Symmetry: D3
Subunit: 159 residues, 6 copies
Amino acid sequence: QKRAIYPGTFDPITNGHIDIVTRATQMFDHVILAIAASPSKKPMFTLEERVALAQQATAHLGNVEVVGFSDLMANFARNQHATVLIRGLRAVADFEYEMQLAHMNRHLMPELESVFLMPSKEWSFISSSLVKEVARHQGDVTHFLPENVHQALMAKLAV
Amino acid sequence: QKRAIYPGTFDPITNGHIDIVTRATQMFDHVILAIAASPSKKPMFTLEERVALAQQATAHLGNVEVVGFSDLMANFARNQHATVLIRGLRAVADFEYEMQLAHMNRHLMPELESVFLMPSKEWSFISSSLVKEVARHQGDVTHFLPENVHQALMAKLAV
Amino acid sequence: QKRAIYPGTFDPITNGHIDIVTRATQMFDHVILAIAASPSKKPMFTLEERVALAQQATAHLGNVEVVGFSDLMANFARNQHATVLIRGLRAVADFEYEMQLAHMNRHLMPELESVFLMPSKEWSFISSSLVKEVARHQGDVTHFLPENVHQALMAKLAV
Amino acid sequence: QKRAIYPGTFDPITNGHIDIVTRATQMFDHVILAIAASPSKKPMFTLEERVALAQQATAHLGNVEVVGFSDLMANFARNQHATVLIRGLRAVADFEYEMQLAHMNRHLMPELESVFLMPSKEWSFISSSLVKEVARHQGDVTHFLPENVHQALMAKLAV
Amino acid sequence: QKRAIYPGTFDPITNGHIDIVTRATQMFDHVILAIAASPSKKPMFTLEERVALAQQATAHLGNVEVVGFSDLMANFARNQHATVLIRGLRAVADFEYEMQLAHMNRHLMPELESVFLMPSKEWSFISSSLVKEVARHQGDVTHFLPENVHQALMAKLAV
Amino acid sequence: QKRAIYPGTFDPITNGHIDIVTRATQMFDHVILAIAASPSKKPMFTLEERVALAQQATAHLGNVEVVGFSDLMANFARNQHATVLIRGLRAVADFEYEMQLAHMNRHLMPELESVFLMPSKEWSFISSSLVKEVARHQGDVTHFLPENVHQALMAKLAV
Ligand SMILES: Cc1ccc2nc(NCc3cc(C)nn3C)[nH]c2n1
Ligand SMILES: Cc1ccc2nc(NCc3cc(C)nn3C)[nH]c2n1
Ligand SMILES: Cc1ccc2nc(NCc3cc(C)nn3C)[nH]c2n1
Ligand SMILES: Cc1ccc2nc(NCc3cc(C)nn3C)[nH]c2n1
Ligand SMILES: Cc1ccc2nc(NCc3cc(C)nn3C)[nH]c2n1
Ligand SMILES: Cc1ccc2nc(NCc3cc(C)nn3C)[nH]c2n1
């Protein structure tokens, strides 16, 4: 009965994201992994690609649902009947931005609670941006990505 | 079903704590507000006082239980069959210490998840320490405390 | 006789800016709200639009003067006979950047003092960028903008 | 016309404090350098010593007044008819605590504005605590102190 | 026998960079100042220009070698037989990013040690970006750049 | 040839310290692990205990020398003919204090360079203080300590 949304750009989904969504499914009955189209960020992968990659990478988790969206995130939460919004916290920089976003989301949807999870030590220093930057210079990022995502990233960069 | 602990010194409990525990009760079935018995620095209020004040200030929340404890937070969570540890996040100093505690707690009790909540803007700058310091120097702290705590703090400082 | 400048991009001016400039006029005899053309930031509103919006939003403050500029900000301060440069401080990120800018400005104009004000709790989490991002997704930002600015933002996004 | 207070422990006053108060005197008509009487941690110098040292070190500034006080900072500002409270900002730890104090002071005395000034690069890493710690361990701190304070600190440490 | 690499975009090299590389040559036998082509950052100066500017600005240091590169930085370190990677640390923002990069580099090349140096007070607030921004508005940046670099920057902006 | 000091309280030495000193020995010819004799806060272990524990835990490193000292760090470095002072960096709180210490040490001993190293992800959240606090509250800290220190800490806490 408790529904949570885990929103992000997931360009592409990393093992840090897999850790966060896994921890969310151990707390809440149903977790919506919500992939924002994010045209302003000029993503490497299309929304359809990101959704497909995330679906395969989370297929082993029975209470996850992957959906793409372009809406205001508070409206999308309401429309999914979610009362929790999950964010992962890595460093001070995101923490300050996440605090601003959480105050804005509270204004837009007061009954949506933002809950923050801290990453595992293994993934505390990675981001999609850092992984792409390493891969673009032909550095090994197999440790940081689900197998299907790593294959897709190698293929994208080969073109 | 889902059991969460909200540990702290609560010396005394403030409206920032009430905000956090209220948010936790809207997320989880049962919330244990856990008051540490023997703080490193001699608290202004005794454990018995802190428990009584917190019980009165949370009596309106049906799924809160106020309990004193003298153990390691993770040992207490384990014995209470809690799978969520609630922490409030106010500033950067908070975030960095909390990250260290969360990594340590994951080592001590892997089946315990640390969840971080953000206070309302109204309470994001207060702490029990700041309220006590202002009150001891004859400043107005009525806005930041439950009525019963306001009364108890005035009585303490009058002697 | 004490003249202060409050510089920024003001794209568009928000209620956080209104709070800062209002507080500045309670401290200093004359405040110049100085709007930088900022072509490098590709602003949503033209400089003329930003100046007009800020003029209307501050018309109730008798000792404010709104001016657009493209100059080095230390030169513009000197040319306005200002000895104080006002900046609002929201989080750690701007604080560090503001410290760098203040040291550079001190090098360029040693007699120009940078003074920093802290925002009201109400506006401590907003920025022009965040308001635009919410509005672009059709979220309600009426609370955060002067009425004339909100109308102009809705109209801009309608085209 | 404009009255400002610059409160602190000044145990002892350093060249960083002299820098801040000098900058304040170039901004405001009258600056009260306000020395707290009963610090939480037993100061190295008595209140009478700290006041005498600060008076000598600021005697060349015609619009500074050095005063001891034992009250809440806002209560003292109010009774001194000050409308500006001066704080120096050095690092991130400074900024976060100062933000909390400023929000509290706005609650306690809405007609008091908190103004933050930045030290010269020369003094941005010093504090009375660091200077005392270096001096007690037989390090050279002459550069960081007014001559009279250097003399008084050497005498204190010799006994 | 101890070889260190000091990588960066150096667009253009500043006196802060000169300070760091000078300190590195006092610690290590041979220092490679490694200039990344950095097309993603759309540099003002071409790689060949940046290399030539850095060579002239470090010609007085006998154990510095300036080289341009487009490789993964861990691979370039290995190929230069370097076991130390030098980074300068200015503020909290770079510190957090540098920590992420250092953890990634440790994954890619475990025997490459990242060592961080703190800048002189004189250069603690400057960056290539800030210097370019000031120069683009015709502000004086002679204090912050080697003579040859300042001439080249003035000439670039004159076109 | 190159002599470095690694100063600290080491109360007790942890695996984070072992990591840092091991990294330092791979960079410099001789590393002095320097244990401060009279900490500001009464250490859990006496100086003789801390030195013996650190000697045993570093006996496998051929170019480490464990020495107690009661002086200013810079005075000790100078007398040991060290030109490098090693510090470990864990978080933002670490970074800001270390920046202040490094600027002061450059004032006290210009020929001493401060070098900052980053701990493995495995140890980036631990400190002697956190380990002691967990152990005194009956938590498992075996993973974070050399075996000899684990034994000594258990014995200390048993009495
Ligand atoms: C309060 C607030 C601020 C910015 C927002 N952007 C959106 N929608 C798009 C979106 C959601 C996510 C996640 N990523 N992206 C690009 N909703 C917002 N809500
Ligand atoms: C990981 C960790 C670190 C310190 C700890 N202290 C405790 N218990 C005592 C305690 C808890 C609170 C709240 N206050 N006090 C005094 N448990 C801990 N767990
Ligand atoms: C020391 C320094 C650094 C950057 C500068 N940019 C300018 N002028 C343009 C400007 C001013 C403001 C406000 N916004 N913008 C875009 N003056 C500068 N001064
Ligand atoms: C909001 C706030 C918080 C703490 C306060 N302490 C005081 N007065 C005592 C004081 C001032 C200084 C400087 N040092 N000392 C000991 N006024 C306060 N106001
Ligand atoms: C771990 C990691 C992350 C990003 C990387 N980018 C590169 N090569 C290009 C590069 C090196 C420098 C310095 N600047 N630039 C643009 N190597 C990387 N290694
Ligand atoms: C610049 C500076 C600041 C404080 C200092 N304290 C010392 N020596 C005493 C000391 C060193 C360590 C480690 N622990 N303890 C107690 N040297 C210092 N240098």
